Amino acid sequence: GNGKYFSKVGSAGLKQLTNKLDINECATVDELVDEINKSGTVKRKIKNQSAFDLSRECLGYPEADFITLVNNMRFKIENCKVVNFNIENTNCLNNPSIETIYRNFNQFVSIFNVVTDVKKRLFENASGNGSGGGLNDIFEAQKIEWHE
Question: For residue 63, what are the domain limits?
Answer without folding.
Answer: 12-130
